[PDB]
Amino acid sequence: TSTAYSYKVVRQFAIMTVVWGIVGMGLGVFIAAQLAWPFLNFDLPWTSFGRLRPLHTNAVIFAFGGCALFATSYYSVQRTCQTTLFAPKLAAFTFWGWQLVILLAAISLPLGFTSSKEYAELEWPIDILITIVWVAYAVVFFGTLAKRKVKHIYVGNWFFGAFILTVAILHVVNNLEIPVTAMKSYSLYAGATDAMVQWWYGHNAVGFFLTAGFLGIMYYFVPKQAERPVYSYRLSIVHFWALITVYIWAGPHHLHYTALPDWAQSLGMVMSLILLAPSWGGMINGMMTLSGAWHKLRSDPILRFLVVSLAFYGMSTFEGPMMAIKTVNALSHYTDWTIGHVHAGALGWVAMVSIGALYHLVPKVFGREQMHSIGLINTHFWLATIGTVLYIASMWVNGIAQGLMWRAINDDGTLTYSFVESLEASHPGFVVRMIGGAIFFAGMLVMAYNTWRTVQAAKPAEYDAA
Amino acid sequence: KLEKNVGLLTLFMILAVSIGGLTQIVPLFFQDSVNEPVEGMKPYTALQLEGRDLYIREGCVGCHSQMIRPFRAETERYGHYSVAGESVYDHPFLWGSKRTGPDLARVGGRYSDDWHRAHLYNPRNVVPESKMPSYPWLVENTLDGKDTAKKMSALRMLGVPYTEEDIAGARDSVNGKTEMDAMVAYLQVLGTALTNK
Amino acid sequence: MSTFWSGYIALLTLGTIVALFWLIFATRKGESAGTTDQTMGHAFDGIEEYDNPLPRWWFLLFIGTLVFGILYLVLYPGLGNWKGVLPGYEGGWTQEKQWEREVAQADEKYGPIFAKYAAMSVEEVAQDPQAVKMGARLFANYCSICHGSDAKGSLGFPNLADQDWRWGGDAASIKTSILNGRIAAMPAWGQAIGEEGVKNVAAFVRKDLAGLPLPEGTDADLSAGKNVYAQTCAVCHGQGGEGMAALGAPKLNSAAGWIYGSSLGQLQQTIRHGRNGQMPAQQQYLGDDKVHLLAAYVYSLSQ
Ligand code: HEC
Ligand code: HEC
Ligand code: HEC
Ligand code: HEM
Ligand code: HEM
Ligand SMILES: [Ca+2]
Ligand SMILES: [Ca+2]
Ligand SMILES: [Cu+2]
């Protein structure tokens, strides 16, 4: 029998997406505040900024983004090819497995156990666990594909598929490390080589985890919510293969004008610029899909999210290539500009798209026809947008100020500004950003409240067969 | 068409996605300039190594780059632009990606130990407008040197030419020293290797 | 780079570029001129898809980036060992060579200026308003973090703005301080002199030398202090507490210039455990030129 989608796992990951969203973004607000008002460090090792930071980072990407991807792919794949998830128990494992990972991150990082590698900060025993959970996830996803009904595999799953495999490779390679003790390992690599392995991993983390994986989301939810066909199949092909291949090369745009050899740096810029095309093929395909149905934007705030989501995606896949030009990175690198780019993509693209996707799916998965309050989806939307824009704006101001101030020479060749002067210049920015994030965070609470109210709804949920 | 073929798609993906990794990372394993240590440079001493791991645990990297870019103004502000050879024994590398505080690639001997101690204990206390967290626990904590031996052995295995002399009694180079002692020792070696070769 | 890895890179790089051009043109095959519509066979849940063409502009943007990629890889290092063809740079462009040039050009510009002040004595530079402005700017960059942004110091760190100098305040002394650094050594008297001994000299130094009043009912033996001071302290600080600039022993007949506080308790700690001030040498970080200007700047401060 069994021909009714396995909605159990999707339900768990959905809820947990909202929970980690809150925890992750809360932490974000908190460390933002620390940068403004250092007393919030509290002279405690576990609550100081240096240790909390990678918690925000891992919480927000792997916990929030992660769960969003699980909830999204498990929902999307099942329907997009019309069978129950392959091995529903192995998928259940990947839930608790993943939760255990996040919980270990929460305990381990403020405790000081970090590899220092950005977005790979968790120590070796946790990297073993991750690999196990990931392999299990790969089997659940690709298995579901392997036992589909239709001859064709939806382009949404090309992206998911890619993301899954390539994150697996990435994760294993960049975490090769000799264990010294329980929670301490040394990287296999050093110096320039380590830097390259790191940013090959680092960029392709957002390249595939935060771009590819989420374009999979976009490809299901934009058309499904809009109820239109996907403008240009062909674009999907080019835009997919070109992205999947060019993105890997973008590693070196992190290490511009560093000890990384010149040749690699260039290879990074050149391919980062090439990448602009395939990236936009994503947003073109998503937005032109809405053509004719633009009137739905005043009507449906869930669609608003998805669309505005692409606006920021587009912007940050433009900004990225620009900042990957050596001369631009020459100003941008080390400054708050990078953080702005990050959050534009992070709040504006990743968060917005997954918000929208959840708002769509959460009711469905809880055997319920829609969210509790559509008005709160709209008020969420505005908080989330105002929030994102403030954050971006304050980081551009800060980043330009920093870049400029650091390199500012006088008429007699001497450096114009002390580093502390640049620090001071940044304070207003640090505060606006803290408010910007706070506002964004408030919207997440509005989501939590909304989701919860809708979850009370029915209790023998499960309404989804053919 | 490869979109009805589950394994064919899988294979071409794992293929497509590999090219950049193979072309950027692999050749660096074999490039000389990024594996040669700078002239006279030694591995980190037991204490320095122990402090580097303290720097790592505290998240210092999150606010501090160790990578001077070859521009005049960076040069003027911090010193000689960082060189591939300087970080050749850095498992893992600690070039930054952010400068909330200044670059530390050459904090060198630019400040006294005494300053470093005061400043880590409470940066606002010496640099009133600092946004750096206070790190007073570094003073209350004592290294026992239990694992220093293992760490060096591990790192030698990874290429770092620690002597048998180094590993033997890396413990008693470290035992009884405070975390703050170790942090300062580490900071005082940063970038010194280049400017005294 | 060996010549194998050199080709290895170039081939895979250009191979990917050739690959992309192929991809872009291959899927652009029987393209439907414009926005067309119609669907395709087979749906997924509900999702269906138009067989629409690649947008003309997006195609060109893709070709733009690819063409530029070649253009750049020809002009600049990247394709393996392929040193650039970029004009103006002899032997091809590297980030190093670009820096060499940048500094070299700065030296042709700011060189004469530095040269001009280097020819003058420290005090001559100090009465040149332009130079002082530069000294001030140098100071803010390399000194402000220890000696304050106002140059007025803080606990542990001399105020360079005042008229009190530990190592002497003539130009030559000031230049030496900055050029060669300075380490002071107030030895510890705790063990040597006894706890009561410490308490007494401290009180003596505070009341009788520095002319500060003693906290209420602190029965110290000032006579003892006086004697302790003459026996031990006076050798470096001069009896009378005039200080000795040779040793960086600061004057004790005025708390004005003290960097370790002036409270009885603080004196007691200085006296009991010693002090080792360090002013780091700048000869290496800044070089003779910058240092000369900085000496002029500091000299200027006090007038
Ligand atoms: C922190 C590491 C400092 C750096 C950076 C700078 N100075 Fe300094 N300086 C420092 C101390 C702790 C002392 C006192 C040393 C002692 O005797 O205990 C000093 C002293 C000087 C002096 C001598 C003042 C005197 O009384 O004779 C000068 C002229 C001086 N410092 C100048 C100076 C300049 C120009 C600096 C920037 C290039 C600078 N100092 C940096 C501590 C530190
Ligand atoms: C984020 C906030 C951090 C944290 C996590 C660290 N530091 Fe720093 N740091 C920060 C700022 C804004 C400044 C400038 C103001 C000041 O000097 O206090 C600094 C400064 C330093 C310095 C002096 C650098 C110089 O002037 O050349 C050092 C040596 C330093 N910080 C060290 C350091 C260590 C060891 C850290 C981990 C315990 C650390 N910092 C963290 C901001 C931040
Ligand atoms: C020989 C060297 C001596 C001896 C015998 C004494 N002093 Fe001390 N002293 C000396 C130096 C070079 C310095 C400067 C230390 C530094 O800047 O790091 C000092 C300092 C002091 C101070 C502090 C002044 C301040 O607050 O800035 C005091 C209070 C002081 N010395 C007192 C003192 C007494 C009471 C002594 C006899 C017991 C004595 N000194 C001896 C050098 C030397
Ligand atoms: C919602 C409110 C948020 C706030 C207030 C916030 C704040 C911050 C702050 C203060 C930092 C450190 C900045 C610095 O060192 O200058 C940071 C880093 C980061 N955050 Fe957030 N964040 C938020 C949400 C998110 C979300 C949803 C994501 C999802 C991906 C995210 C991803 C990141 C990443 C990747 C970094 C590291 C940036 C880097 O290493 O350059 N953040 N965030
Ligand atoms: C066309 C695709 C993109 C390109 C070429 C690109 C390029 C760049 C560049 C040049 C930097 C600065 C590196 C540095 O100076 O340190 C950067 C930082 C970053 N970007 Fe992107 N970006 C792209 C898309 C995105 C998107 C959509 C996101 C959103 C998730 C994102 C997330 C990040 C993060 C997290 C960092 C900081 C990593 C660090 O801590 O150094 N990128 N990116
Ligand atoms: Ca890891
Ligand atoms: Ca960063
Ligand atoms: Cu990147």
CATH classification of the domain holding C302: 1.10.760.10
Decide: helix, strand or coil at residue C123: helix
Residue whose CA is at the smallest distance from ligand 1 atom 19: C279
Place of tokens 């250009």: C14
CB pairs under 8 A between A and C: 163
Q: Are residues C116 and C89 in the same domain?
A: no
Q: How far apart are CA A276 and CA A314, in angstroms?
A: 9
Q: Are residues C86 and C4 in the same domain?
A: yes
Structure tokens at B194: 């280049």
Q: Are residues C80 and C207 in the same domain?
A: no
Q: Are residues C157 and C284 in the same domain?
A: yes
Decide: helix, strand or coil at residue A415: strand
Residue of chain B minimizing CA distance to A244: B17
Q: How far apart are CA A240 and CA A216, in angstroms?
A: 10
Q: How far apart are CA C129 and CA C126, in angstroms?
A: 7
Q: Are strands C278-279 and A177-181 parallel, antiparallel or unpaired?
A: unpaired
- Which numbered ligand comes closest to the C-alpha of C162? 1
Identify which of A61, A64, A85 has the alpha carbon closest to the alpha carbon of residue A73.
A85
Q: Are residues C271 and C284 in the same domain?
A: no
Quote the minimal CA–CA distance from C219 to chain B in Å: 33
* DSSP character at residue C158: -
C111 touches A: beta carbon within 8 Å: no
Residue type, C284: Q
Structure tokens at A140: 């659940």
Q: How far apart are CA B16 and CA A242, in angstroms?
A: 9
Q: How was this structure determined?
A: X-ray
From chain B, pick out residues whose CB is under 8 angstroms from the CB of A262: none
Task: Round to the nearest angstrom and report the end-to-end CA distance of chain A.
Answer: 12
Instruction: Write the burial class of residue B132 (CB in 10 Å: 0-12 exposed, 13-18 middle, 19+ buried).
Output: buried
Q: Are the beta carbons of B24 and A252 closer than 8 angstroms?
A: yes
Helical ranges in A372-458 per DSSP H: 375-407, 419-425, 427-456
Identify which of C295, C12, C270 has the alpha carbon closest to the alpha carbon of residue B15.
C12
Task: Round to the nearest angstrom and report the end-to-end CA distance of chain B.
Answer: 60
Q: How far apart are CA B52 and CA B46, in angstroms?
A: 10
From chain A, pick out residues whose CB is under 8 angstroms from the CB of B151: 180, 184, 186
Residue type, B52: R
Dihedral sign from CA coordinates of A441, A442, A445, A450: negative
Q: How far apart are CA A410 and CA A419, in angstroms?
A: 15
Q: Are residues C113 and C8 in the same domain?
A: no
Show which of residues 338-397 on chain A sit within 8 Å of chain B, judged by CB atoms.
338-339
Q: How far apart are CA A6 and CA A465, in angstroms?
A: 9
Dihedral sign from CA coordinates of B86, B88, B92, B95: positive
Domains and their CATH numbers in chain A: 1-466 (1.20.210.10)
Tell how far the Cα of C199 is from the centroid of ligand 4, in angstroms. Answer: 55
Q: Which residues contact C98 (CB under 8 A, 6 or more apart)?
A: B70, C89
Please spell the DSSP secondary structure of chain B, one letter per residue.
--SS-HHHHHHHHHHHTTHHHHHHTHHHHH-STTTSPPTTPPPPPHHHHHHHHHHHHHTGGGT------SSHHHHHHHSS---GGGGTT-SS----SB-SS---TT-TTTS-HHHHHHHHH-HHHHSTT--PPP-THHHH-B---TTHHHHHHHHHHTT----HHHHTTSHHHHTT-BHHHHHHHHHTTTTTTGGG-
CATH classification of the domain holding C70: 6.10.280.130
Q: Are residues C7 and C65 in the same domain?
A: yes
Q: Which residues contact A116 (CB under 8 A, 6 or more apart)?
A: B56, B61, B92, B94
Domains and their CATH numbers in chain B: 1-35 (6.10.250.2250), 36-197 (1.10.760.10)
Q: How many domains does chain C divide into? A: 3
Which resolution, in Å, applies to this structure? 3.2
Q: Are residues C177 and C291 in the same domain?
A: yes
Place of tokens 């904590």: B141
Task: Round to the nearest angstrom and report the end-to-end CA distance of chain C.
Answer: 60
Residue type, A145: L
Q: Are residues C100 and C58 in the same domain?
A: no
Q: How far apart are CA A460 and CA C145, in angstroms?
A: 66
Helical ranges in chain C per DSSP H: 3-26, 56-75, 95-118, 122-126, 129-142, 144-147, 171-180, 190-193, 195-204, 222-228, 234-237, 264-273, 287-301
Q: Are the beta carbons of B196 and B121 closer than 8 angstroms?
A: no
Count the residues in chain C: 303
**C5 is in which domain, residue-wise?**
1-94
